[PDB]
């Protein structure tokens, strides 16, 4: 049917990814144009179709701003694009319990696809203040119950290792990658694409 | 989950020339790596060219370098065989098939146990 594979790697599985971009002044405007980057390569080693792998990308500061969510019928090559131009915030907080909460009420509300996998890559730079993380286990509970596989990607010195500690803790395919910087997203890449797609079945209908 | 189909066969001259295709079908097919196998009279199947999902990389047998170049148009999801200056040893029974062994990763395929859908056959027969 619709537009051919760009790479030999290849995600034909049944999967709800959501892409979620610390939006934080942790990174420089040219850091957050590696992180998109990064994004853009993923979406192009998966098959993108309601039948096999949905994608979601968000933008998280005190708020979430989405740009693509998991039921937009538009053509991968558009997708990707929208991606490519996701605005740099340099916000002074990046919330996880924030974005966290929007997956969970927002994206996950309900499971249309029970029969994918569904995983939030919750992409790391920064930690939040204190008085914002009252709920943060909280809402990965909420995640779990909704058989919502979280991966922590901390990126940098200043993102949140006790987080990433905890988001592991509340259940076990709940798996992360701690990163010295953006570089290292692109060395790792391959194997980070391999780990979310065996996660994933292949058509169980 | 995958149904490949043959096409192109028939007889030729020794030094003719031939192209098979192949057409992929089905649901789970995902422009998989792709492979042309033959079983010649009293032979084993035979690999004789492997191409990767995106046409990148090929792989042939040393023994038929120059008589054969498998290619693929993933917007028809066929793969082809280009046969040249055919002999004599190329008179057998070629099948089209596709590694389905962790297809996600579409680099070219030699090892046949790797190869899991396989076509129908058709006849090459190089005479006079």
């Known amino acids: 049917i619709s537009e051919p594979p760009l790479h030999d790697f290849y995600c034909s599985r049944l999967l709800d990814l959501v892409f979620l971009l610390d939006g934080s002044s942790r990174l420089s405007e040219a850091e957050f144009e590696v992180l998109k980057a990064f994004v853009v390569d993923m979406m192009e080693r998966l098959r993108i179709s309601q039948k096999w792998v949905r994608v979601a990308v968000v933008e998280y500061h005190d708020g979430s701003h989405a740009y693509i969510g998991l039921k937009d019928r538009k053509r991968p090559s558009e997708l990707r694009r929208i991606a490519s131009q996701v605005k740099y915030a340099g916000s002074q907080v990046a919330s996880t319990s924030e974005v966290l909460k929007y997956t969970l009420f927002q994206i996950f509300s309900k499971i249309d696809r029970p029969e994918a996998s569904r995983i939030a890559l919750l992409l790391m730079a920064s930690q939040e203040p204190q008085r914002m993380s009252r709920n943060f286990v909280r809402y990965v509970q909420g995640l779990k119950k909704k058989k919502v596989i979280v991966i922590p990607v901390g990126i940098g010195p200043h993102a949140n290792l006790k987080q990433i500690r905890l988001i592991e803790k509340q259940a076990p395919e709940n798996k992360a990658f701690v990163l010295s910087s953006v570089d290292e997203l692109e060395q790792q890449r391959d194997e980070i694409v391999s780990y979310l797609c065996d996660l994933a079945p292949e058509a169980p209908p | 989950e995958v149904q490949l189909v043959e096409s192109g066969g028939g007889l030729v001259q020794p030094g003719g020339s031939l192209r098979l295709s192949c057409a992929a079908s089905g649901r789970t097919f995902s422009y998989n790596p792709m492979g042309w196998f033959r079983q010649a009279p009293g032979k084993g199947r035979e690999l004789v060219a492997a191409?990767?999902?995106?046409?990148?990389?090929?792989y042939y047998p040393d023994s038929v370098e120059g008589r054969f170049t498998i290619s693929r148009d993933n917007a028809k999801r066929m793969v082809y065989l280009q046969m040249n200056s055919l002999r004599a040893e190329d008179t057998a029974v070629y099948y089209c098939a596709a590694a389905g062994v962790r297809a996600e990763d579409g680099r070219v395929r030699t090892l046949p146990s790797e190869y899991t859908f396989w076509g129908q056959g058709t006849q090459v027969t190089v005479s006079s």
């Open positions: 191409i990767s999902r995106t046409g990148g990389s090929t």
